């Protein structure tokens, strides 16, 4: 009801909808509410949200529908978004980046383990609690890629062009997991350089060709230390069948380097 909740401010807009800081008119509890203005899509999103139980995935509370409006209730992330911790053209301190990347991989390992692909991993969708623990949010593009132990290939184009893997632009069908791995490597680049390497990973994009030709003396690569750059060389591999998998990311030298807060 317009009587149970006060909409105090917009937190942003997701793939399919928009998000308000709602305050309870009775208890003053502050939550995030996603306000859906119109379906088969939200039925699917609510179903996936009900599956989620992990420290690095957003807490779902429940949902209400009123006419052509539906309301999804989630834990308000008191630390805001990772996007807001990235200093343009700088990034953030390498130890903070490494901890966030550890937590990102734990959330993604959890999702992939229950056969869910997120499909829109980017800093706008990665939230922080009051202890700066990272939470993977926005399940509006999420879908099942594994059921009864059988993999299904993806065939729909979606996500955010600077974060999408190249196969998603080129192939009629592709594996879900390597796409999410790619977008995590663009997130790591953003965290360490405070800039995105390209508009899209297409041959008609010069910044993408430059990377394929290994010109890491150019930005954003020249801002990144050799160890995390070496991980980014294994993640941002054009052929998804040669791209590093999460088990191997967990064996990376930089991933395992002790770093000082
Ligand atoms: C408390 C707070 C948040 N907290 C928050 N908590 C959520 N739970 C979501 C959320 C979801 N779910 C979401 N969005 C936007 C569209 C995609 C989705 C991830 N956004 C953006 C969410 N932001 C964001 N800033 N601040 C502070 C700092 C500046 O302002 C107040
Ligand atoms: Cl910016
Ligand atoms: Cl950025």
Curated annotation (Swiss-Prot):
Catalytic residue positions: 120
Disease tied to this protein: Oocyte/zygote/embryo maturation arrest 21: An autosomal dominant, female infertility disorder characterized by zygote development arrest due to failure of pronuclei fusion.
Recorded GO CC terms: centrosome; chromatin; condensed nuclear chromosome; cytoplasm; cytosol; extracellular space; intracellular membrane-bounded organelle; nucleoplasm
Biological process according to GO: apoptotic process; apoptotic process involved in development; cellular response to mechanical stimulus; chromatin remodeling; DNA damage checkpoint signaling; DNA damage response; DNA repair; DNA replication
Coarse class of the protein's main subcellular location: nucleus
Chain ranges of the Protein kinase domain: 5-255
Regulation: Activated through phosphorylation predominantly by ATR but also by ATM in response to DNA damage or inhibition of DNA replication. Activation is modulated by several mediators including CLSPN, BRCA1 and FEM1B. Proteolytic cleavage at the C-terminus by SPRTN during normal DNA replication activates the protein kinase activity.
EC class (word): transferase
Cross-link Glycyl lysine isopeptide (Lys-Gly) (interchain with G-Cter in ubiquitin) per UniProt, renumbered positions: 122
Known EC number: 2.7.11.1
Region (Interaction with CLSPN): 1-255
Keyword tRNA processing appears in the UniProt entry: no
Subunit and interaction comment: Interacts (phosphorylated by ATR) with RAD51. Interacts with and phosphorylates CLSPN, an adapter protein that regulates the ATR-dependent phosphorylation of CHEK1. Interacts with BRCA1. Interacts with and phosphorylates CDC25A, CDC25B and CDC25C. Interacts with FBXO6, which regulates CHEK1. Interacts with PPM1D, which regulates CHEK1 through dephosphorylation. Interacts with TIMELESS; DNA damage-dependent. Interacts with FEM1B; activates CHEK1 in response to stress. Interacts with TLK1. Interacts with XPO1 and YWHAZ. Interacts with CDK5RAP3; antagonizes CHEK1.
Family the UniProt entry places it in: Belongs to the protein kinase superfamily. CAMK Ser/Thr protein kinase family. NIM1 subfamily.
Tissues expressing this chain: Expressed ubiquitously with the most abundant expression in thymus, testis, small intestine and colon.
Name of the gene this protein is made from: CHEK1
Protein name (database record): Serine/threonine-protein kinase Chk1
Keywords attached to this entry: ATP-binding, Cell cycle, Chromosome, Cytoplasm, Cytoskeleton, Disease variant, DNA damage, DNA repair, Isopeptide bond, Kinase, Nucleotide-binding, Nucleus, Phosphoprotein, Serine/threonine-protein kinase, Transferase, Ubl conjugation
Origin species: Homo sapiens
Catalytic activity: L-seryl-[protein] + ATP = O-phospho-L-seryl-[protein] + ADP + H(+); L-threonyl-[protein] + ATP = O-phospho-L-threonyl-[protein] + ADP + H(+)
